[PDB]
Structures are given as structure tokens and as C-alpha cells.
Amino acid sequence: STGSMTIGIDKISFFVPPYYIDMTALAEARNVDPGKFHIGIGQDQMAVNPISQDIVTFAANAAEAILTKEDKEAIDMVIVGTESSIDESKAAAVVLHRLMGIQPFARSFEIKEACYGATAGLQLAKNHVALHPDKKVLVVAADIAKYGLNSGGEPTQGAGAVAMLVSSEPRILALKEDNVMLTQDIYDFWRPTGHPYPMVDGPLSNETYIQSFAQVWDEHKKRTGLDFADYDALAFHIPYTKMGKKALLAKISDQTEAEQERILARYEESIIYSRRVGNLYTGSLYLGLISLLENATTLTAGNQIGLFSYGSGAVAEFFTGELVAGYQNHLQKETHLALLDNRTELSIAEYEAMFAETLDTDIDQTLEDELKYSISAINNTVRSYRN
Numbered sequence: 001s002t003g004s005m006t007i008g009i010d011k012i013s014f015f016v017p018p019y020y021i022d023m024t025a026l027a028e029a030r031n032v033d034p035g036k037f038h039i040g041i042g043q044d045q046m047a048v049n050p051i052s053q054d055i056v057t058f059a060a061n062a063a064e065a066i067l068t069k070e071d072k073e074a075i076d077m078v079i080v081g082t083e084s085s086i087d088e089s090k091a092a093a094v095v096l097h098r099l100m101g102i103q104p105f106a107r108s109f110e111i112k113e114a115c116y117g118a119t120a121g122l123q124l125a126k127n128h129v130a131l132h133p134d135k136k137v138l139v140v141a142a143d144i145a146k147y148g149l150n151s152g153g154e155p156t157q158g159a160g161a162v163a164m165l166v167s168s169e170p171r172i173l174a175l176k177e178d179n180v181m182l183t184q185d186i187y188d189f190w191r192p193t194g195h196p197y198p199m200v201d202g203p204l205s206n207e208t209y210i211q212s213f214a215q216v217w218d219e220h221k222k223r224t225g226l227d228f229a230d231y232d233a234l235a236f237h238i239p240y241t242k243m244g245k246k247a248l249l250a251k252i253s254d255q256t257e258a259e260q261e262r263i264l265a266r267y268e269e270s271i272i273y274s275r276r277v278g279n280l281y282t283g284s285l286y287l288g289l290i291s292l293l294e295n296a297t298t299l300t301a302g303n304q305i306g307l308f309s310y311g312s313g314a315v316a317e318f319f320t321g322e323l324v325a326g327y328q329n330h331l332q333k334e335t336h337l338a339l340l341d342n343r344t345e346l347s348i349a350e351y352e353a354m355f356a357e358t359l360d361t362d363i364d365q366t367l368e369d370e371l372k373y374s375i376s377a378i379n380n381t382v383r384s385y386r387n
């Protein structure tokens with residue numbers, strides 16, 4: 001049968017701060033071969049932000065790129081998935097709801113589970129719309145991935161947000177009901193209260209990440225009978241581009257030469273933008289989706305897209321979407337390329353200073369920044385934004 005209600009991603013966009021540092025410049029400052037960052041790790045430009053830009057700034061900018069008048073009237077749920085919260089009680093989603101001018105009778109909250117938070121939001125939104133097909137949900141991934149100067153994870157760093165509008169009859173990606181979820185209690189990466197930077201066991205994280213994909217994939221294959229041949233492309237959450245390729249490589253070892261090339265070529269398309277941005281944590285998978293859709297030229301209506309989401313801790317999920325005819329007319333390629341091209345290239349000195357600076361919310365202060373939705377002042381610990 002056809003004619004059934006479809007539910008999924010109607011519009012999607014990302015935002016990153018107007019600054020970056022080139023990995024060659026970093027490599028040289030770190031006394032390391034630039035090839036080690038550019039190729040070994042697989043990153044080219046690291047998105048960096050000043051203290052006048054937080055998850056609200058990025059979420060607001062990303063969402064503003066896709067929301068229209070009618071969307072703002074139909075949205076009754078606003079969700080932010082993040083692991084970079086600025087408050088322990090008040091959800092960042094509440095401020096986003098105001099800044100976006102969304103209609104008042106909506107619920108807003110924050111979801112936390114490492115880089116999986118936005119995925120939890122996406123699937124829950126899907127179910128919400130299934131029961132309420134006239135309504136829409138704003139789901140935004142927002143994060144600031146900082147490991148530390150001279151840390152192993154430094155070259156993988158990034159910052160920004162990915163906003164998605166979930167609705168019935170979505171114009172881009174129709175989501176399936178083939179979800180396979182997994183939870184394991186593992187301390188590969190975490191951030192205890194009071195830690196500005198994360199605790200991380202790189203080895204354990206990479207091992208758990210790779211095995212988590214294998215595990216949900218095998219279960220999915222067992223439930224559905226679908227194999228890699230049945231997927232036109234796969235989008236992955238990734239800690240960094242090379243590790244993503246390694247998780248994929250590990251699982252397609254038994255595929256024919258031609259299918260490996262096809263699948264790997266798709267992966268390369270999915271990491272175009274990540275190479276110029278770095279890790280968005282919760283937004284990494286969905287940046288990969290945008291990148292795939294905007295850089296691929298042979299993808300078409302009806303194609304099946306597999307999505308692997310991961311959260312340290314650890315949680316994982318594999319689910320499927322189908323490209324909706326006409327989707328190529330509802331992307332934001334021009335805007336994204338302009339967004340990436342109009343950034344300032346920071347010197348190592350400028351980078352390390354911006355990175356080190358900290359916002360002390362206990363001190364009332366004023367902050368100057370041209371970016372819309374940036375922090376304009378702190379008063380009694382309360383952040384004011386431009387609007």
C-alpha cells in the first residue's frame with residue numbers, strides 16, 4: 001500500500017561560529033606533521049568560538065535558517081540535545097523558544113546523553129507528530145567540543161549546531177520504524193560536574209564506538225534482513241572522520257570490492273563539511289546527513305539512507321530514512337558554503353587565546369559581537385542575547 005502518512009525531516013541546516021584555525025597551522029605549532037591531522041585524523045579546519053557565543057547562539061542561528069511563519073505557528077515542542085549546557089536546571093530550549101518567536105503553547109526541554117541527545121529528540125518528535133500530524137517539532141543539536149590545548153583530542157574539536165524541523169509529509173527524509181537501540185554502561189567518555197573538559201579513554205571509546213555499530217547493525221540485519229546492498233548511503237556519528245571510516249570498514253569487510261567502493265564513496269561525501277568544521281558532538285551525525293545530501297550528485301528520490309547514532313556512556317541507535325522526491329530543492333548548500341567561506345582564519349596565538357578565555361557568570365559584564373543571538377551582557381548570572 002501507499003498513501004500512508006510519512007513523518008521525518010522536513011528541513012535541516014547547520015551553523016558554526018565565524019572563526020576557524022587551519023590544521024596545518026595547528027600541526028606546526030604542535031611540532032607535528034600536518035598530514036597527521038589532515039589525513040591521519042582527517043580534519044582540515046577547526047571551528048572555534050569566543051565566550052560571547054554559546055549553544056543558544058548556535059541553536060538560534062541554525063533554527064532561524066529554516067523556520068518560517070507557518071512553522072512557528074505549528075510547532076508545539078522544542079527540543080535541544082546537548083552535552084554543553086549552561087544551566088543545571090533551565091533548559092536551553094526555553095530561550096530558543098523565545099528567540100525563534102514560536103507560538104507560546106508548546107513544551108520545551110533539553111535532552112542529555114553525550115552525542116546521542118539530538119537523536120533521542122528526533123525519534124520522540126517523530127512519535128509526537130504521528131499522534132498529532134498537524135503539529136511540528138523543532139529539534140536542535142548544539143554543542144562545543146573542546147578537549148584542551150595540546151590534548152590528543154584537540155584536532156577533532158569543533159562547535160556549532162544542527163537544526164531539524166520534524167513534520168508529517170516531510171520534504172527531505174521520511175523516517176522508518178526499523179529502529180534498533182542499545183545501552184551499555186561504559187566509561188569511555190564522560191564529564192563529571194565541575195569539569196570544564198571531558199574525561200576520556202580514547203582506546204576504550206574507539207573500541208566501544210566501533211563495536212556498538214557492529215552490534216546494532218547485526219541486530220538490525222537480523223530483524224529486517226536488509227544488508228549494505230540495500231542501502232544507498234550511510235550517515236555516521238563520528239568522533240573524527242578517520243575513526244568513522246574505520247568503524248564502517250570493519251563491518252563491510254565481507255562485501256564485494258564494488259560495494260565497498262560505492263559505500264566508502266558515500267562516506268567521503270558525508271564528511272565534506274565535517275572536515276571543515278570538526279566534531280559537533282550531538283550534531284555530528286546530522287551534519288553528516290546534510291553533507292551527504294548537499295555533496296552527493298547521484299542520490300535520488302526513493303534511496304534508502306542508514307543512520308548510525310552514538311553517545312558515549314554509552315548509547316547507540318541505527319535507523320533508516322528514505323529520500324523524498326523534490327528534496328534537492330529544499331537544501332541550503334549555497335548558504336552553508338557561504339557560511340564556511342566567510343570565516344576568519346585565526347593565528348595560533350589568536351586561537352589559543354579565544355580557546356582559553358572563560359566566561360565568569362558571577363561578574364556582571366557586557367560582551368560585544370556582531371553575530372545575531374550572541375551574548376550581549378551578563379546580569380546576576382543571567383545571559384542576555386541579541387534578537
Ligand SMILES: *C(=O)[C@H](CO)[C@H](O)CCCC[C@@H](C)C/C(C)=C/C(C)=C/C(=O)O
Pocket residue numbers: 041083114115116151152153154156189200201202203205206238239281310311312
Ligand atoms: C559522543 O558521543 C562523544 C562525546 O560525548 C564523542 O563521539 C567521542 C568523544 C571521545 C573521542 C576521542 C577518541 C577523541 C580523541 C582523544 C582522539 C585522538 C586523536 C586522541 C589521541 O590521543 O589519539
